Design a binder for this molecule. Structure first.
Ligand code: GRA
Ligand code: GRA
Ligand code: GRA
Lengths: 566, 566, 558
């Protein structure tokens, strides 16, 4: 019961059954994966109040609230270890990511009430903007599980002011609303000032019976003593915390609904989520959802931690996409890249990925050359330009699989227009106006990181994820030390020492964990977890898209076919 | 020769001649202004190569290139002291701001070739985004005077990766182009990799004859020696720097034009600027341009450095806007704010500004009260909501003059809807979809900083400026130390000591210079320089606006009139 | 001083010098062209008040006002003979088209004050919407030379009410303003009610000193008493200068005479944003290398004769240069880049004649030029999509008899590929011009950048050799009456009617095509359109970031 099975079903299948496993490699990847999981667990547990203590006082933690909201097994966290300003607890005081609620994907943001009652900490504003941007680009509902005490007083200068500070999300929520994207808030505990605007900015307000939202909270030694007198007098005065339920439900009616406990609040949210517009994804399917035909655990063997080793990218694609099917656009032209159509739970996506290894008699603009997989040449850049443009016309979201060492350099490459072709790709992406996912398989480096659907496209890239085998740098430490200090040897030992410093630093500052802490990549995900994220993304993309191309009116399949025959 | 003189000419005049000058105050302001000018001069001079040395080698500095481009006296720098990451030289290696070129306003970005040949330094990416955002919001041409050596190798992790890093401007330039906003580049010196994409991303490329743009640049002790052999062999090889004029002019034709020297490049830019679409501002005028009727130097007396002193805001408005004329919207309603129409070189703007001092028998929702000027109440918030909405419909840009201590707090204020009214203002602003300017007169604090056209509105606020009398904090240090440590005295000397630490820190981290270094405000401007910036902004706003309301079809003047009569 | 001469300069040249002229054909074309010119002249002269009488009373006619405004030789009229409701005078009481004012292209609408003082007549509302749509799609300034007495009382039911009636332009002017497109009005004579809203809706109002704009203007024996009492009362016509200048200030400026009003308009036009077209040029403007008058020989009036489309393209575009996209693939169509006064346009045009061993989905087949097959439709889909990305406007040259029919064609996806083209055009979001060379027929007329794309096609023009029908009269009579002597008679009626109702003049009267233009006048219209398109475009693609030239090159080499 689908359109055009001749084009969209029984596509060529790709990938081989894994002949030689590699335990050493698998163990190396899993060591990175373990450290990530361990750091996340330690960070989620950190803070002045435990989950156990929270539960005793009648409150749920962020993860408890999240797990009560979502369909089991659908949680795709992002920015778990994001901590650009290096807070001691290791987080930005929010837990965020994608989750599914009774079949509907939503973007979830949860205050960490274990840590200073969910206070604004350095790096949080940035994290929050990455949330609302994702919702914006995907037209996906934004859900706040809110428990926010506002500005951290010692850090006010880092959390209160500026273009992208604590005030920005309030504008971003109005923008979402104006773009037709609903925002739903569960209001827990005390939310004064900063937390008050997080409470009031959403579309729908569901309150805990003890919760509040307010413009402002309650209310030498001779100086020092005076304060404790006023405090204990006000405490015996028993004035209620401003903007409690008797105010914001009974008087202003800004609280739409009030629930007795945390799980009641969740039920309220679930109810309003059920009201939200969403396609039955069947509408956009070209085939019934099918698992890949090769197991994802093979990826622990296929993707080498030895950064000097090539591998076959088709083996990766075969394990990530429905039924191991792939419909390649212009195979043979631009051999440094794979571009083609694939399926994700029956839904069309365009896949763009680096080819690794030696490229015989290539590029064409060089007399007698061998090309390096992971680099970009003329035909690859042109093929991508076309494929992006075609997918954009067809309203087909793009998933980029990056493992790249840059664009070809030198005057032969220059004459081949590579600088202009790279920028043309940037222009093509910006022109596409569709949500896109970027997945760093191993190397994200040079300008290729930018042009290959990089997170530098703030209008199209929703977020980025990386595997345990990934690394981010401008160029390898060795090449960098070279270009920096080679001319300073044309003059001149103190220089040798700081070349080895640079090499060491580039290794340190390019490790997967460091990369996600700085937010270079949003999440480090397990090899068995990459497809889940692709599924989350793709289903979110097609849940309520702002534009449609009927299948019979799509150009990509037609142009792909013609190139194969003509 | 203007529409509706009955509405737009002979408006009420405001302001008094200054009776009592205040030398002490004037001197205090000018001390802040001097320190700013002095820090800017020191920062512009800093770097491994002087202007004198640059000139000897046949090159102009950033400021020389800028001064050769612009009409004399039209330079409005922004982010002069922006240095969020605290680079030693004190800058982000770019000089940026507004400048006029033969009557046309343009946004200007100039590489600082005194410092590591214009290398990407920490904080630069952010600075560059503030540039392209301004051009985007105002539909104003972006001009690059480019001399960029790319990534600073030691700092690569801070300048190369991430959503808002060195790659982002290349996407932002494509966005500008796609929105119909031209980008023009003068290409000087060597521009490899990162600087190559700054070269190629603009609409128009004008090159210095010795300049280049490229995807990549040229080309233990036994290890160490090997490098200097290859280097000196390549140096004697005399291979030209990749992507020089014989390549990018003669072969690729990406350089549109080539000039012999720096001033030739400027002439080329001037020529292409002359091609750009721009209104004769006469088209949008409602009166002939007229100076204010009171001198701006009085502002050194009027605006008190004593943060506890009120002043009359009308005295400020009278000195900033054409002919000291003001057409107030709903005077008497919402007395804590002034909202009304003014003129800037004959062009209509909407002005929103705090009233200072005691407000008798106010707010209305309190039994017997005296209101504090600089705070926001019910009627003020509602009046602003309406005025913003009206100006938005009329396509009249808004200028916000902030001097504020926040929104009224407590359950009487809550019942009066202040939390929802504040957010309604945010929604109203976001809905306006027009470029806006924010000017901090003194206090930018609390949520009022956000709602009063704050820079937290990334779609509407083009940039923000502040006077020498300005200060930024969440709340005063004393109130902050209180709310932080008062409950920790209900338990318990080590606490007293860190309360005085907080008070001191809030004073340090809220000084005008510190605020602009962090980018809380984009520029600290002289009292005599505020009108110039307002003129730059307003004329840029009306140069090529994307939407028009004919004067006879404007609602703001009509509604303003009806309230006065009915 | 241009980007990428390697791509944009010294493109292949096309066309041959004309070997054998054809006087018979030329004369046949010029006979149609003469009849058009003659009908236009008669229509412009028609009406109860002559130009001579207007001049005596101190007033200029529509054409005098237009000719005083525009740079000489830049007038591109549209809808000259548009008269869908068949008014006796032959017009819709407005003169409209493209004109250039001191180098700036603008859209011009002028009230015909020769005819019932510029009253609203049947068909006018539709004509006015075609004006504001053009301005909308090109972001081009709209100029009204206004002299409008409002609703024609006898015809009120046809000019006053409905979604697309006399009130619609007032909403369309607000839309233009909100899209940032300025509207400038010169207010002449009396403009009450309907004409009052034409006066007030624009951005800028310039008034003649005797002019007015108003909400409303100023048994049997009883009426003439009140009338003569009011006439002796000497009450001024409502909303005159002492009101709308002195009191309301809705008139921005007042001039003593018609030419003063024009000067005021010129001044405000000079204020308007416009590129120096040099900014978007890839070469200096160059005439074609073959004369346009050859087209009188090249394009056959004998509708059964093929001709070489390249000969047409060679005579319309700068320096006879053409950079063809995917030559050899989809031979029934020509798609490629060309230049118009140095500016890039994408050209899509039918190939005529026999196509050997084609289409590929059939066995031993000969293809018919002017028809659309699989590869043509796919090539156009790609080329449209590529030009859209590159912000390159499209010019469509139509001479077509439809899309291939039958189950082999169906299996080849032709129905879906045709609609994909429609989708592709709608997706392009750029102003486009459509020129009917000869045949506009079947679904091909729709998909080949037809005027049915109300968001992209600015207007359409046709040559004297053009004709519009669903299908030929013979084929139509067949399909209608084959399944059915009284029947033979009404088959010949149908054939005759299809010939009658498909003549160039009839087509433009009904608005099927907006203007019938002379063979020597096609390039001028292309120049007007292209220069208007690039005057103030809403989106740019830098030359070095364009995909079309790159993809075109790769197909040639790879
Ligand atoms: C640019 C020139 C030719 C200029 O040399 P010059 O004429 O001597 O000029 P000068 O005023 O004496 O300044 C040179 C001096 O300024 C400093 N400097 C220059 N560039 C950098 C940098 N990128 N990072 C850190 N420091 C830099 C160094 O101390 C230079 O000394 P040196 O030239 O080494 O003797 C040269 O210094 C050079 O080649 N520099 C940088 C090497 C390079 O190729 N860098 C590209 C950086 S990687 C990148 O941006 C990648 C982005 C993503 C991608 O596309 O891959
Ligand atoms: C929120 C509550 C009621 C929660 O108290 P609780 O029930 O004891 O909860 P708990 O788990 O024991 O946590 C309290 C403890 O967590 C820490 N903490 C809490 N909030 C902050 C903060 N904002 N900055 C820095 N540290 C904070 C403190 O150590 C708290 O201890 P304390 O309550 O003082 O004994 C209370 O701690 C409180 O009132 N906190 C903050 C005071 C306040 O009113 N803050 C508003 C911050 S200003 C702002 O955000 C302005 C934005 C712009 C504007 O609108 O003006
Ligand atoms: C406009 C002038 C002042 C023209 O001055 P003039 O020197 O007489 O000019 P002329 O060359 O001699 O032309 C007059 C002659 O042209 C014809 N004519 C003029 N206006 C109309 C019309 N509206 N419908 C049908 N026929 C009209 C009539 O035969 C006129 O003869 P008449 O003036 O009756 O002796 C005058 O004819 C006049 O006052 N006409 C009546 C105009 C009028 O009442 N217009 C309102 C039309 S209703 C409407 O548009 C409402 C729309 C909805 C709304 O906004 O309410």
């Amino acid at each position: 019961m689908y359109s055009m099975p001749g084009y969209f079903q029984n596509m060529p299948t790709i990938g081989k059954e894994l002949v030689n496993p590699n335990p050493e490699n698998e163990q190396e990847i899993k060591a990175v994966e373990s450290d990530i999981h361990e750091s996340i667990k330690k960070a989620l547990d950190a803070g002045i109040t435990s989950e156990e203590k929270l539960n005793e006082r009648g409150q749920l933690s962020a993860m408890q609230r999240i797990n009560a909201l979502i369909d089991p097994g659908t949680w795709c966290p992002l920015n778990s270890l994001f901590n650009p300003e290096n807070n001691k607890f290791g987080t930005t005081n929010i837990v965020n990511g994608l989750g599914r609620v009774d079949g509907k994907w939503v973007y979830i943001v949860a205050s960490d009430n274990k840590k200073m009652a969910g206070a604004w900490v350095p790096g949080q504003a940035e994290n929050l903007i990455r949330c609302s941007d994702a919702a914006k680009m995907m037209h996906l509902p934004l859900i706040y599980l809110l428990n926010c005490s506002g500005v951290e007083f010692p850090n006010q200068d880092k959390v209160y002011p500026n273009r992208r500070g604590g005030g920005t999300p309030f504008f971003r929520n109005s923008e979402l609303n104006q773009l037709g994207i609903p925002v739903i808030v569960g209001i827990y505990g005390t939310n004064p000032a900063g937390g008050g605007y997080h409470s009031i900015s959403p579309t729908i307000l569901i309150a805990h019976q003890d919760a509040n939202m307010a413009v402002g909270g309650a209310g030498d030694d001779e100086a020092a003593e005076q304060i404790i007198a006023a405090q204990i007098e006000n405490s015996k005065l028993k004035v209620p915390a401003p903007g409690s339920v008797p105010i914001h439900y009974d008087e202003t009616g800004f609280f739409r609904e009030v629930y007795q406990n945390d799980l009641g609040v969740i039920d309220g949210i679930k109810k309003y989520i059920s009201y939200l517009p969403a396609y039955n994804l069947e509408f956009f399917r070209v085939d019934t959802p099918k698992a890949p035909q090769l197991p994802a655990e093979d990826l622990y063997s296929i993707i080498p931690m030895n950064q000097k080793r090539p591998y076959d990218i088709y083996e990766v694609i075969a394990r990530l996409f429905d039924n191991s099917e792939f419909s390649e656009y212009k195979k043979g032209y631009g051999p440094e890249m794979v571009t083609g159509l694939a399926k994700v739970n029956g839904l069309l996506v365009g896949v763009i990925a680096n080819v690794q290894g030696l490229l015989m008699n290539y590029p064409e603009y060089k007399q007698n050359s061998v090309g390096i997989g992971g680099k970009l040449y003329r035909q690859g850049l042109i093929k991508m330009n076309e494929f992006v443009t075609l997918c954009a016309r067809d309203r087909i979201p793009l998933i980029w699989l990056q493992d790249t060492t840059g664009i070809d350099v030198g005057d032969e490459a220059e004459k081949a227009e590579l600088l202009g072709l790279g920028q043309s790709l940037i222009y093509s992406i910006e022109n596409s106006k569709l949500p896109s996912l970027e997945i760093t398989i191993r190397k994200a480096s040079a300008a290729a990181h930018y042009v290959l659907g990089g997170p530098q496209g703030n209008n199209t890239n929703v977020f980025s994820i990386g595997t345990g085998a990934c690394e981010y740098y401008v160029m390898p430490g060795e090449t960098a030390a070279n270009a920096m200090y080679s001319r300073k040897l044309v003059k001149a030992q103190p220089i040798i020492g700081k070349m080895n410093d640079m090499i060491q630093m580039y290794t340190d500052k390019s490790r997967p964990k460091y990369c996600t802490e700085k937010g270079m990549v949003d999440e480090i995900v397990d090899m068995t977890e990459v497809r889940p994220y692709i599924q989350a993304f793709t289903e979110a993309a097609y849940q309520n898209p702002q534009s449609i191309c009927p299948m019979h009116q799509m150009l990509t399949p037609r142009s792909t076919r013609e190139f194969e025959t003509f």
